[PDB]
Structure 1
Amino acid sequence: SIGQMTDLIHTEKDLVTSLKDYIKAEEDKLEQIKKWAEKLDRLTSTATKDPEGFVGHPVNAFKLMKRLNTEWSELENLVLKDMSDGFISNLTIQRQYFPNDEDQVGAAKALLRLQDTYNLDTDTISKFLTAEDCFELGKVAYTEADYYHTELWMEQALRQLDEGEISTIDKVSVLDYLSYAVYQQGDLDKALLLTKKLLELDPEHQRANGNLKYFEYIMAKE
């Protein structure tokens, strides 16, 4: 319902403000540390410039022994200090009303169906969807034997990869999925070409080699 989604949106907005509070806290700690590190840097610089004269000074041996024995431990404790508990506690609480996998897949199938209903191409929809997003949609289709959508979305994922989008997915796996889905469509020509793309990328790929031969076969027997 509209209301459930509305509450989700509000929750996420609050999570963002809380997140920004965490960021602010961490930045303040880092600036304290940065200033500290600046002081130490000027210090150590002057000492390394002339270590003998440095340990001439009667105060310097004491100050050095103190910094090393005491101050660096204070510094250590500040570095290790956890700034994240408020945000994590809060997020932990909000997760109670979060969606699950089934909600996510469901929302995805809904995306496919809207794609059909409004006659939209994957690029226009994607422009935002990431390569990984497209790939996921492709796999959602794939699990239900909807190879038309599997095909369209793996194609989009691959296209985004080609435009040089940085992503966690390699062209090879998506080429595998794609060529498989296309073969299942019946476009053996396309499937063959894509298989050849895959082999150009990973030449040792077992199924792609086997499929190069097998596709050439059934194509011959057509």
Structure 2
Amino acid sequence: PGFFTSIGQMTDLIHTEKDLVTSLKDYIKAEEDKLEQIKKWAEKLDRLTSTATKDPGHPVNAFKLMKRLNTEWSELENLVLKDMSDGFISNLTIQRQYFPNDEDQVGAAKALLRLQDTYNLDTDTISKGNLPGVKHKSFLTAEDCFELGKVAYTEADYYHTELWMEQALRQLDEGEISTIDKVSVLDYLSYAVYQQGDLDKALLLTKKLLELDPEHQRANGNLKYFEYIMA
């Protein structure tokens, strides 16, 4: 229905985003310039204050001090407080009105998972930009992998939850810097593995998790559960 118009939209968004980067780069230059000015100011004040303090009333010094405290520090304060981001933030705010939202992001994640399921694609192939045509181009981060795994999880696809969580963990092992909570990754991964019936592996992953978070309530309970049954 509105399908073909939506293609038109994504193309427009790609060009909009390029304009946002231009704006962002302008903001950066403005902040760099402001910071260079403050650094030179701080350097001057550093020299003045250091000299004045390592000294264990003269009207020249008194005038210079009164004026610096009363006047010069207020001008410095005004510069520190000066916002350089208005232009960038104004444009971003206007442009966001046309951005995809959380539902769109989830929709796209599901469409990727659907493609994977249809062509039986392996995760590393998807993640490392090894799908045909677009060769070695778009890469998924460890966090992207975790997110896809969690979408699979909400749909009760524990098989793909397992594959995506393991990909996230492999990328970390390979040295990817990331902010994902590896405990949480293991939390979902151990449950997905448990659901498919591999108790041995679920037990293993539970022990891995407890190394990282000894107080993890759910994992501690899972270990007692496994130790009860498996033993």
1:36 positional shift: 1.3
Rounded to whole Å, the distance in 1 between the matches of 2:12 and 2:21 is 14
Higher normalized helix content (fraction of residues): 1
State the secondary structure of the residue aligned to 1:6: helix
Rounded to whole Å, the distance in 2 between the matches of 1:12 and 1:115 is 28
Q: TM-score under structure 1 normalisation? A: 0.87
1:155 positional shift: 1.3
Rounded to whole Å, the distance in 2 between the matches of 1:146 and 1:191 is 17
Deviates more, 1:6-15 or 1:131-140: 131-140
Equivalent position of 1:189 in the other structure: 200
Residues 171 and 63 from structure 1, CA distance in 2 versus in 1: closer, same or farther, beyond 3 angstroms? same
1:110 positional shift: 1.5
1:139 positional shift: 1.0
Question: Is the aligned partner of 1:26 residue 2:31?
Answer: yes
State the secondary structure of the residue aligned to 1:167: coil
Residues 57 and 162 from structure 1, CA distance in 2 versus in 1: closer, same or farther, beyond 3 angstroms? same
1:164 positional shift: 4.2
Rounded to whole Å, the distance in 2 between the matches of 1:131 and 1:190 is 22
1:118 positional shift: 4.4
Equivalent position of 1:198 in the other structure: 209
Rounded to whole Å, the distance in 2 between the matches of 1:175 and 1:101 is 25
Deviates more, 1:168-177 or 1:19-28: 168-177
1:111 positional shift: 1.6
State the secondary structure of the residue aligned to 1:128: coil
Deviates more, 1:100-109 or 1:34-43: 34-43
Deviates more, 1:31-40 or 1:137-146: 31-40
Residues 29 and 184 from structure 1, CA distance in 2 versus in 1: closer, same or farther, beyond 3 angstroms? same
Rounded to whole Å, the distance in 2 between the matches of 1:49 and 1:200 is 53
State the secondary structure of the residue aligned to 2:97: helix
Deviates more, 1:174-183 or 1:29-38: 29-38
Q: Deviations over 1:23-46 (max 9, x none)?
A: 111111111111211222222233
Unaligned runs of 5+ in 1: none
Rounded to whole Å, the distance in 2 between the matches of 1:179 and 1:197 is 10
Q: Deviations over 1:46-96 (max 9, x none)?
A: 333436xxxx65412111111011100000011001111111111110011
Residues 32 and 204 from structure 1, CA distance in 2 versus in 1: closer, same or farther, beyond 3 angstroms? closer
1:172 positional shift: 1.5
Equivalent position of 1:162 in the other structure: 173
Equivalent position of 1:7 in the other structure: 12
Q: TM-score under structure 2 normalisation? A: 0.84
Q: 1:150 aligns with which of 149, 155, 161?
A: 161
1:208 positional shift: 2.2
1:211 positional shift: 2.3
Q: What is the root-mean-square deviation in Å for CA atoms of aligned residues?
A: 2.1
Rounded to whole Å, the distance in 2 between the matches of 1:4 and 1:147 is 34
The number of residue pairs the alignment matches comes to 216
Rounded to whole Å, the distance in 2 between the matches of 1:217 and 1:154 is 27
1:17 positional shift: 0.4
Rounded to whole Å, the distance in 1 between the matches of 2:139 and 2:14 is 18
Among the aligned pairs, what percent are the same residue? Answer: 100
Rounded to whole Å, the distance in 2 between the matches of 1:58 and 1:116 is 83
Equivalent position of 1:175 in the other structure: 186
Deviates more, 1:182-191 or 1:111-120: 111-120
1:125 positional shift: 2.6
Deviates more, 1:203-212 or 1:130-139: 203-212
State the secondary structure of the residue aligned to 1:149: helix
Rounded to whole Å, the distance in 2 between the matches of 1:62 and 1:29 is 28
